[PDB]
Amino acid sequence: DPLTQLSLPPGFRFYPTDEELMVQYLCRKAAGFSLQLIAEIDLYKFDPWVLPNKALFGEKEWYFFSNRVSGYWTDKIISTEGQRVKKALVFKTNWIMHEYWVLCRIYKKQ
Amino acid sequence: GIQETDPLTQLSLPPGFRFYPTDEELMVQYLCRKAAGYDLQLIAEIDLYKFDPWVLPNKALFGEKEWYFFSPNRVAGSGYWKATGTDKIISTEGQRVGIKKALVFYIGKAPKGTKTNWIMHEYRLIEPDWVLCRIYKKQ
Numbered sequence A: 001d002p003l004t005q006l007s008l009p010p011g012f013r014f015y016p017t018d019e020e021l022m023v024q025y026l027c028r029k030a031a032g033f034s035l036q037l038i039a040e041i042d043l044y045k046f047d048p049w050v051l052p053n054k055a056l057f058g059e060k061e062w063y064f065f066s067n068r069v070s071g072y073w074t075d076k077i078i079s080t081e082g083q084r085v086k087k088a089l090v091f092k093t094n095w096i097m098h099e100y101w102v103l104c105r106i107y108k109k110q
Numbered sequence B: 001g002i003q004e005t006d007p008l009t010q011l012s013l014p015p016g017f018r019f020y021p022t023d024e025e026l027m028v029q030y031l032c033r034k035a036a037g038y039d040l041q042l043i044a045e046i047d048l049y050k051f052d053p054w055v056l057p058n059k060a061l062f063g064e065k066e067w068y069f070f071s072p073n074r075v076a077g078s079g080y081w082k083a084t085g086t087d088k089i090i091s092t093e094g095q096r097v098g099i100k101k102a103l104v105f106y107i108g109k110a111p112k113g114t115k116t117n118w119i120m121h122e123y124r125l126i127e128p129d130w131v132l133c134r135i136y137k138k139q
Helices: A018-029 A048-054 B023-036 B053-059
Strands: A012-014 A061-065 A087-090 A095-099 A103-108 B017-019 B066-071 B079-091 B097-107 B114-126 B131-137
Touching: A018 A103, A048 A061, A048 A095, A048 A103, B023 B066, B023 B079, B023 B097, B023 B114, B023 B131, B053 B066, B053 B114, B053 B131, B079 B114
Parallel strands: none
Antiparallel strands: A012 B017, A061 A103, A087 A095, A095 A103, B066 B131, B079 B097, B097 B114, B114 B131
16 A cells, blocks of 8 residues: 555645646656556456456545446546646446546546 | 754655645544644644734645644734634544634724635634634635
């Protein structure tokens, strides 16, 4: 478990912004992670509900590098520094995927 | 002396890690722990009611859009903090109850001072000696 070894103080979480995800992770995946908090997974060898286990960490959301495949799956222009470089999906279920090698947040709703 | 470290984060926190505490954390891990007597120090002790809200950000050891403080209607600097909406209860197993109270800053006398966007959430424990406050600006 990587999070424990970061000696993270009570209340310190991973609340990344759509901008940070772009530049610091996705962009950094070309030639880029000292401690790879989010790993690779072929996200569609799977049904939404078991991914959390194979995420390296997470309480309520999970992040992965990756009508598509027991079931199947408006995006807004993200800009950084006023210069541009995300898509929402559903599995019908509380199972939501955020799409940004691509970077995805998965979480359960309501 | 030889090096003594400075206010902030040492933590080499991986890009993406805020301090987004939950109401339970602020209660248990901070407010309660302070109130018990602890000490990686993270939340500034400050008399909030000494200062205008906009001078505050610089006094928190960190914070991008908000600032936590421990502090020992009411009146502060050029104005006054106004209680708001309804206080919200927080209960931690097995025991402690704390109240989040919401307040807004007004410049001037009491009535009828002129409203601002300065918001304060105040976390206080209930017992039979501090408060914990989030300060931030609306919008």
